Amino acid sequence: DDSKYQCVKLNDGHFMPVLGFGTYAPAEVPKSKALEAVKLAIEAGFHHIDSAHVYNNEEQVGLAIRSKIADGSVKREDIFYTSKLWSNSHRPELVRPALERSLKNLQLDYVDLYLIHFPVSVKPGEEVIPKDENGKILFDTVDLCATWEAMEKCKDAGLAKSIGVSNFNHRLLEMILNKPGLKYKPVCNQVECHPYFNQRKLLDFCKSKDIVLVAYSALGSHREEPWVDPNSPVLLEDPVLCALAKKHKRTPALIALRYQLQRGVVVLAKSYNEQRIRQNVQVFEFQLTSEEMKAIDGLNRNVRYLTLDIFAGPPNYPFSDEY
Ligand SMILES: NC(=O)c1ccc[n+]([C@@H]2O[C@H](COP(=O)([O-])OP(=O)(O)OC[C@H]3O[C@@H](n4cnc5c(N)ncnc54)[C@H](OP(=O)(O)O)[C@@H]3O)[C@@H](O)[C@H]2O)c1
Ligand SMILES: C[C@]12CC[C@H]3[C@@H](CCC4=CC(=O)CC[C@@]43C)[C@@H]1CC[C@@H]2O
Known part of the structure; x- marks a missing residue:
């Protein structure tokens, strides 16, 4: 039965599929590969697709989605598509224009989810990482509560079904949640998460506010x-992941994905390889015991792969705080 799939109810009433397809690939990889990969992911059973303006692939991702709807493989209501607002468009007046630009590249009428990509703002313009004459990034001073109000207007206009954040820490989440006149809470916080950096504290804070953590x-x-x-x-x-994989006749990737599902996290997985795409959907074919979950919890070791430390300095840089 392919018209049903595992999802989670968001705090605005919409439903998010619990397994998402990651679409970023290095610039070296031809864009024809992104188009093909998304088609293969939809064919394999992925119903949640994650991209962003800065990945430079929304034209291809949108074409893949539209091709799989037009060939009858899936309906638009059974695709959950996410885009993200880049940091050169945090000013409230520039939020809607950035979303419209993504939608025009995608050729879609709406995104299921629009996120603030990263909490540090950079000067507006066509450059995505604007730099001065000495190579210094040009930071911008923007009140993210104002950015959030502009996100709320995009949801009220129907351009985004749901709105959320990415790379927010505890303080930044509280700033949004305590905003005077708040209309919509963020539905999710999309952050790095895996057995070497399991985000327990931030995950529990998100759970306490009915915010989904997307890994x-x-x-x-x-x-x-x-x-x-x-x-x-x-x-x-x-x-440990390899030993669990061998015991179950699975793979270390499948163990890592299943770990997230059983701790209440929505998990992304990027693959441009046909067999690995098909393999990853096998996360719904087995379950981990409580002892196995504990063994995986024991791997936590403070390894953050993505620091994005070229954006460090401003108070909104999110990774200097404990969580
Ligand atoms: N919000 C943010 O700031 C942010 C930051 C980073 C990532 N993301 C999103 O999250 C997605 C996922 O993460 P990522 O792109 O960092 O990667 P990832 O999902 O952690 O994957 C890592 C690598 O794993 C390989 N792989 C996939 N399935 C595998 C399997 N079954 N067995 C062995 N290897 C496998 C892939 O290679 P092959 O392609 O060759 O299979 C890929 O290069 C991104 O594409 C993007 O959509 C968002
Ligand atoms: C798009 C881009 C390459 C990919 C970069 C992007 C800045 C943000 C970023 C952070 C990462 O850690 C992954 C690669 C990306 C997504 C860069 C800004 C200019 C550059 O061409």
Whole structure:
């Protein structure tokens, strides 16, 4: 039965599929691969697709989605598509224009979810990481509560079914939740999460407010230089994950994805390979015991692959606080 799939009810009443397809790939990888990969993901059973303006693939991702609706493989209501607002468009007057630009590239009428991508703001313009004459990034001073109000207007206009955040810490979440006149809470906080960085504290805070944590780099990340240090440990070579995989005749990736589902996290998984795409959907075919979950909880070791430390400095940089 393919018209049903596992989802979670968001705090605005909409439903989010619990397994999402990651679409980012390094610039070297031709865009024809993103188009094909999304088609393969939909074919395999993924109903949640994650992208962003800065991934430079929304034209291809949108074409894939539209092709799979037009060939009868899926209906628009059974696709949950996420886009993200880049940091050069945090000013409240620029939020709707950025969403409209994404929608025009996608050729879709609405996104299911629109997120604030990263909480540090940069100067507006066509450059996505604007830099001065000495190579210094041009930061901008924006009140994210004002940005949030503009996100709420996008939801009221129907351009985004749901709105949320990404890369927010405890303080930043509280700032939105305590905003005077708040209309809509964020439905989710999309952050790095895997057995080496399991986010227990931030996850519990999100649970206490009915905010869903959406895990990125759940398989150990793309490991793309300069974003990820090559000396960071390779998640999927972990001996505990590999031993659990061998016991169950599964793979370390499947163990890492199932861990997130059973702790109440919505998990993303990027793959541009036909067999790994099909493999990843097998997360719904087995369950982990409480002892196995505890063993995986024991791997926590403070390994953050994606620091985005070129944006460090401003008070909104999210990774200096404990959580
Ligand atoms: N909000 C943010 O700031 C943010 C940041 C990072 C990522 N994201 C989102 O999260 C997605 C996922 O994370 P990521 O892109 O960092 O990666 P990831 O999902 O952690 O994956 C890592 C790598 O795992 C490989 N892989 C996939 N399935 C596998 C399997 N079954 N067995 C072995 N290897 C497998 C992939 O290679 P192949 O493609 O060759 O299979 C991929 O290069 C991104 O694409 C993006 O949509 C968001
Ligand atoms: C789009 C881009 C390459 C991909 C970058 C992006 C800035 C944000 C970013 C952070 C990562 O850790 C992954 C790669 C990305 C998504 C860069 C801004 C200019 C550059 O061309």
